[PDB]
Design a protein around this ligand. Sequence first.
Ligand code: NI
Ligand code: NI
Ligand code: NI
Lengths: 227, 227, 227
Amino acid sequence: GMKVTFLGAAVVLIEGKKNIIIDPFISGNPVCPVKLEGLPKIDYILVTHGHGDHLGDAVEIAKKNDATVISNYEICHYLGKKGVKTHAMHIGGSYLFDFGRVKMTPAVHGSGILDGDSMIYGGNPSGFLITIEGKKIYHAGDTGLTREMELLAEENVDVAFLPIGGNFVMDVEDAVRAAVMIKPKKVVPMHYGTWELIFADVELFKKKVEEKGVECVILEPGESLEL
Amino acid sequence: GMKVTFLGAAVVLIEGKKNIIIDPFISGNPVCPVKLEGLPKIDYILVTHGHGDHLGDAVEIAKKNDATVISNYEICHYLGKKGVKTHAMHIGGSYLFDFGRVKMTPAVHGSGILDGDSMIYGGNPSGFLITIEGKKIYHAGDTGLTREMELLAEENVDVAFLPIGGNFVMDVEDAVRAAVMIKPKKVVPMHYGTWELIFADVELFKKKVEEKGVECVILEPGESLEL
Amino acid sequence: GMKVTFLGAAVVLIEGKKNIIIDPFISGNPVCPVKLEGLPKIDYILVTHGHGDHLGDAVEIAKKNDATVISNYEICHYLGKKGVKTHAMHIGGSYLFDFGRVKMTPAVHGSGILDGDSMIYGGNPSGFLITIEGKKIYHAGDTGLTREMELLAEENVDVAFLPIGGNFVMDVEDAVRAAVMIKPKKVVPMHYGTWELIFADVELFKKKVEEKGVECVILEPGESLEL
Ligand code: NI
Ligand code: NI
Ligand code: NI
């Protein structure tokens, strides 16, 4: 019975046999309810793409916990030069870890790593399909709407984390279209405005996505759900 | 009223409440009939990807007109260090501007920025779906045929600008397939071979696309249409 | 007549009226049974993406043979500064060469070029659809499962080279799904171990993909087929 906690932006913590965290943007994230010290022991870190507000505090968390970062080849190379342990993958690749299976999914987004004022190439953006104890979590990462999401329909995803922020990522309308393509058991909106207050827009997502027959669990940063 | 002018390569000028230009490759472009001075006042510049013949004169046009560049995060970061004002987006993201709505669409291509003799990462390539006064223009940018184009069918696009040059982008055969996926009211071919040695190709496209029930409006560089 | 030889990793040699090699990872490749000296005269070199185990010995082979490298714009720019002849293309673009037609196909993968310990942007990853004397060969490059593969069904591919290694690329299950999307007459697994074992993966692929009516030819590094 694992515990899945949303911590603002696109940060998702998964506590089970091991502890996994996705896109750990904690320090400098005004919507995140915890500090780095408030996180438990971290075994694995999943990074969807290179942008600063997803790559986040991965280096500091990896070193302090002796955790392995799971990401694409280019991101793992960049992190390797910082003395971070990594398990490289790429888009559409899967691997069976001790805790369960992780698969990188396609996404439509940039993956530039900002280092100083230089833009370093961090591969292509992704999502993650994670299979733990027969339960499937889909974290879309930063992405626009893409027909590749229809590949996840046969997976029967238990929970789908989709961005609804707009501008940099799907808005409410497209996120509803993604939710219908994927058809998960539940959908959690995230990255809703990249803002502290979104109540109007996130409720509009819940209303519209449930009209299409997909249950929406709104999790405020800090809140959890069980699987 | 709204005037849309094709200026060769992938250059598209849209004149209405505000003036916006897409992929402004003007100086250096031997098929572009106007110089930089022949352009009106520009409010916004849209860049689909980092390649020189699309990024073009964005820096100079922006500085002279105090215009804002709309492109992906990585391209806007590059332009920001040149002292250019930007509004960053990414693939599948939309935003409502004063003149209308802009949405970045997926493309299958590259997006390298050539700065001197170094290849800087300019994110992933895109197109643009612009909504102005209930009228929709689709500019595909440089792209190959992709199933993501089928997402635009429900938009009921009025004018679609598709490249047909081949080698770097779609050819005539594939561009006809894209038109049928998108089902726009009108389709304008662009980015065709330079030096005007390809009037046989554009006519073949017009013939082939209209056999599939899509009106084709051929525009020589300098010509326009209304919306 | 045509002799198509698989040389381990994703190395494919095509011998006809001209000699073409794809992703020439020879010298550092432990599974490749030949050395550079063991190759015949090479006329063209095709590179799917920038990763070292595919870009391989392209520079050295091109200079010795005075061969031309066909790849995306960013990869050809990188090779152009090494004094290598190139024909740049991009995703979805095709060109008719003397030996036949080459077309770049979409892929879901990174294309980072490692130069020293610096990651250079090498465009987006691709595959190649090659038409020689009315026969079609699809080399998927490194890629996950993508809905773009459905576009190749109408091509009626004679031989498809798909990766089945997992982790960095599609595993056996996903590779079967790709074969059903593409519907080639024959399919050849590659990039599997590439270590001799696991061999049971390759046998499982053969069994499963032939249940879907697609002939599977298992080529050991060194083995060939006529086309
Ligand atoms: Ni992002
Ligand atoms: Ni281009
Ligand atoms: Ni690779």
